[PDB]
Amino acid sequence: IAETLTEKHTLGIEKVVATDSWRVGITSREKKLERINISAEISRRIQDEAIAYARNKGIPYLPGINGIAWKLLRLKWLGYTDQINVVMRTVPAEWRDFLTQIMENTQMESMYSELRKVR
Amino acid sequence: IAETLTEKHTLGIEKVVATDSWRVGITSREKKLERINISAEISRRIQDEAIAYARNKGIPYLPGINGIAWKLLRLKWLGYTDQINVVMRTVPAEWRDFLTQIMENTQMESMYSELRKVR
Amino acid sequence: IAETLTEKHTLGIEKVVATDSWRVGITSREKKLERINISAEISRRIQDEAIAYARNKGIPYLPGINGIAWKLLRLKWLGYTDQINVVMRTVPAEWRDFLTQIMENTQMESMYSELRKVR
Amino acid sequence: SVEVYRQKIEKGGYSAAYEATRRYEREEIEVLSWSSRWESAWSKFGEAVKALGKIEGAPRALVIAKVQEALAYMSKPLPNMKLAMAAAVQAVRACEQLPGMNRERCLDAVAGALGVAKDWIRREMT
Amino acid sequence: SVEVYRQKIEKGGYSAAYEATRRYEREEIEVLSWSSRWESAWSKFGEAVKALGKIEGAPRALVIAKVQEALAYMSKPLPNMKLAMAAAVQAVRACEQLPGMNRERCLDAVAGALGVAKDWIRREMT
Amino acid sequence: SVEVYRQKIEKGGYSAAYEATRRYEREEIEVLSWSSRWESAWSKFGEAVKALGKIEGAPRALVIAKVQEALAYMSKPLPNMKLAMAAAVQAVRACEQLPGMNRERCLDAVAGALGVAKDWIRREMT
């Protein structure tokens, strides 16, 4: 009868709950799921550095600088460099040295862990 | 009653879901299905070089240049050479050397893999 | 009541779907069916040469020339030779040598395989 | 072989062909849609073979077969008149071998059945 | 191989195609919604191939394929006229190898099928 | 891999999607409430990517992605115009390296799609 994008989205879901393709979609890979382990590892490593940065300079801990330091880490891997330049103007002054600490100064530890995750 | 192409397409589908020919169309071949493995192998072997090419030259990673370089690999295998020359004018300047790297400079590894896939 | 050629075709089908003569028409032969195995062989042999002929002479691979080379093989077997000469004028110039490569130069391999199929 | 013969006998073809005739006479069977698609496409090949009636003599199967092969190329959605003339000049050369038939009498019948001009088949003869 | 043959024969496709035909004539089956979405998108591809009728000669499959590949880029939501001209010039170069076709007559048929100007395909040939 | 392919094949997706299509036509399925919230929110992202039609040339995914990323920040409950401009200048720099596009002509297509002034993206270029 009808075929538009609201009903294509619906009938694509009704076939999923019919054949149980979601739970067999997760349990059949079992090799992509180790990325959830590695992503939770770099997540803690950035967070611990942000508190150690905050008590050395006596500045308050700014929540959400974990995510800013992570987006700049992933775009550094791809090469979107002028995107890095505008975010570095957007963050406050005392935290700009922390963001380049995640990209350049821990090139050895953190940038390797993304290289194992995308592999 | 009716015989037109919209009904020829329908009664082909109604015949398939009656006799269950789709799932036995896949599970009876079992030799053609190894082409999916060799396809996913060259898929990664093109993608990993595109990021290494992106960081050697400091240019951002351009998504879809792994798709373009896979098309030009197959047309080179067939012999559609004037197809290639118009595509090479379409891509940007810094990525033209990557596309001839997928065709010529890895004639050993990647061009043999397409030769084994079609066998 | 009525007997024309349309309903003669229909009433021949209705006694096929009643007695199930199609499926027992195939499964009772079981010796003629290996002609499919030999036909699948010569199709592969012609197609592999047509790509190798395309890269030695630098020309694009022309699809359907594996079909023309197989028709001219079977008419050479029967002897319809003035059928051949008009088809040889029809094909392009650089592909005329491949057509007489299938009939003449691989008579030992390919023309025996047709000779073993009709037997 | 008899082993392929016996297996089609035991399915009862004589009885069920009789039974399906009765259902047609008792209005329980209509014309299948495969049949209506068949007679609409085949009817051009039926009257063209009857136009080869004035060819006399020997086994005439090669004349009939290559003319039906010649009409098949003309009747495509993209008609190939080059390959259609290739089969027709074989039907002409097969025709002239029969006793009583000349080369010009064969170009009468084959070009008359295909419905094209006689000079087209003369070109690819050579 | 005949093993892939035997696994599809035993599924009974001749009887099931006949029986699904009878259900359509007895008005028990309506047109699937996939078929309605199919002919809406495909009908523009069907008439362009029939506009390649005046190309004569050899296997014409490569001319037919690369015209369908050229229309597919024009018909995207973001049409790429650069990559569409990439496949079109392969169709012109594949066309002119056939006996009887000039380069200008191949530029006639392809630009008439695609529905664009002849100078756009002349540019990329060089 | 094939083993990840096989376990979705044996679940019967071609059959089950056919049955859901028939149930919609027989009024046995209404439109899910997730699809109403989807099409209400997505539609501003769909008409804007079609406004990048006159960008011509290479793989245009990086222009398309960084424009879609730029609309996501403006459409927040608390919109961040500074982080939206960060993704826009990556789209402008990715656009101008395509053959045929200028620096100024990419500033029309990006700012026309986003619906902002052209000087907002020019300030952040530097």
Author numbering:
A (entry chain C), B (entry chain A), C (entry chain B): 10 to 128
D (entry chain b), E (entry chain a), F (entry chain c): 2 to 127
Paper text:
Tristromaviruses, which build enveloped filamentous virions and infect hyperthermophilic neutrophiles of the order Thermoproteales, represent one such enigmatic virus families. A cryo-electron microscopic reconstruction of the tristromavirus Pyrobaculum filamentous virus 2 at 3.4 Å resolution shows that the virion is constructed from two paralogous major capsid proteins (MCP) which transform the linear dsDNA genome of the virus into A-form by tightly wrapping around it. Unexpectedly, the two MCP are homologous to the capsid proteins of other filamentous archaeal viruses, uncovering a deep evolutionary relationship within the archaeal virosphere. Our results uncover an evolutionary relationship among three families of hyperthermophilic archaeal viruses, Tristromaviridae, Rudiviridae and Lipothrixviridae, including the homology of the MCPs and the similar compaction of the genomes as A-form DNA by these MCPs.
To study the virion organization of tristromaviruses, we have determined the structure of the Pyrobaculum filamentous virus 2 (PFV2) at 3.4 Å resolution. Cryo-electron micrographs show the membrane-enveloped virions of PFV2 to be ∼340 Å in diameter and ∼5,000 Å in length. The helical symmetry was determined to be a rise of 2.86 Å and a rotation of 22.95° per asymmetric unit, where the asymmetric unit contained a protein heterodimer and 12 bp (base pairs) of A-form DNA. The DNA, almost completely covered by the heterodimers, tightly supercoils in a solenoidal fashion with one right-handed supercoil per 45.4 Å turn of the capsid helix. The native twist of the DNA is therefore 11.3 bp/turn (564 bp in forty-seven local turns plus three supercoil turns). There was no ambiguity in fitting the sequences of MCP1 and MCP2 into the density map given the resolution achieved. While a 3D superposition of MCP1 and MCP2 shows significant differences in the overall folds, a flexible secondary structure alignment reveals a one-to-one mapping of local secondary structure elements indicative of obvious homology. Notably, PFV2 achieves a similar coverage of A-DNA as SIRV2 and AFV1 by swapping the upper half of the MCP1 N-terminal helix-arm to the other side of the MCP2 helix-arm. In contrast, this spacing is ∼30 Å in PFV2 suggesting that the lipids are arranged in a similar manner as in the host membrane, perhaps stabilized by VP3. Due to the shared virion organization, we suggest unifying Tristromaviridae and the order Ligamenvirales within a class ‘Tokiviricetes’ (toki means ‘thread’ in Georgian and viricetes is an official suffix for a virus class), the first class-rank taxon for archaeal viruses.
